[PDB]
Design a protein around this ligand. Structure first.
Ligand SMILES: *[C@@H]1O[C@H](CO)[C@@H](O[C@@H]2O[C@H](CO)[C@@H](O)[C@H](O)[C@H]2NC(C)=O)[C@H](O)[C@H]1NC(C)=O
Ligand SMILES: *[C@@H]1O[C@H](CO)[C@@H](O[C@@H]2O[C@H](CO)[C@@H](O)[C@H](O)[C@H]2NC(C)=O)[C@H](O)[C@H]1NC(C)=O
Ligand SMILES: *[C@@H]1O[C@H](CO[C@@H]2O[C@@H](C)[C@@H](O)[C@@H](O)[C@@H]2O)[C@@H](O)[C@H](O)[C@H]1NC(C)=O
Lengths: 88, 49, 22
């Protein structure tokens, strides 16, 4: 298992895409799966090394195109909304 | 006399705001309605339909 | 006066500092 990078994981038939990180969520022996308000998984227990992993969906956001009219130029600027200048 | 009444009237506004939270209800309700509407949208993902 | 599912909030064009200046 690879951590801190967007990966496509499969835990015991549970599939999804997200970033797996170490977590400080204190699970209990009868429970393996954490859960979100919207019923999506939020933490898994590693089936072989029992540490709890956080699942964060890979970074995303809207992309806007800022342009003068094509009656003036064909040059445009791109705004990546609510994202740093690293994931571009 | 008029200037002193004005200065005291402004001072009372500060005392009113600093203690009564309900004074801003017209703006808090707008914030609450949008957050309440958005949370309902999120909860709908948990339904089977 | 006081997420991961495609729901975002856009920032207002007039920042609060500009509102006070007006
Ligand atoms: C198969 O899974 C077991 C789970 O118990 C592994 O045994 C230990 O699991 C703990 C989980 O916290 C980890 O320290 C290590 O994975 C294991 N430690 C020791 C001392 O055995 C077991 O190793 C797994 N087998 C293989 C081949 O991965
Ligand atoms: C986005 O970029 C900003 C600007 O570089 C960074 O903000 C970090 O914020 C944390 C805590 O809020 C602090 O370590 C620093 O203020 C910033 N760190 C660095 C390395 O600049 C960060 O890269 C990103 N922040 C967010 C919230 O996405
Ligand atoms: C649309 O553009 C027509 C011709 O475009 C011309 O060339 C480009 C490169 C620009 O320099 C532009 O300013 C020039 O006019 C115009 O004839 C036409 O009027 C334009 N449309 C409108 C509504 O003005």
């Amino acid at each position: 298992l690879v951590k801190n990078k967007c990966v496509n994981f499969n835990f015991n038939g549970l599939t999804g895409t997200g970033v797996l990180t170490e977590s400080n969520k204190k699970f209990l022996p009868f429970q393996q799966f954490g859960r979100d308000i919207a019923d999506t998984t939020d933490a898994v227990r590693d089936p072989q090394t029992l540490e709890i992993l956080d699942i964060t969906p890979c970074s995303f956001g809207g992309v806007s195109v800022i342009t003068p009219g094509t009656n003036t130029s064909n040059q445009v600027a791109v705004l990546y909304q609510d994202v740093n200048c690293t994931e571009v | 006399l008029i200037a002193n009444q004005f200065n005291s009237a402004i001072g009372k506004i500060q005392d009113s705001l600093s203690s009564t939270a309900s004074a801003l209800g017209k703006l808090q309700d707008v914030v609450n309605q949008n957050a309440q509407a958005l949370n309902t949208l999120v909860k709908q993902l948990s339904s089977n339909f | 006066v006081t997420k991961f599912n495609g729901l975002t909030v856009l920032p207002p064009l007039l920042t609060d500092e500009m509102i006070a200046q007006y």
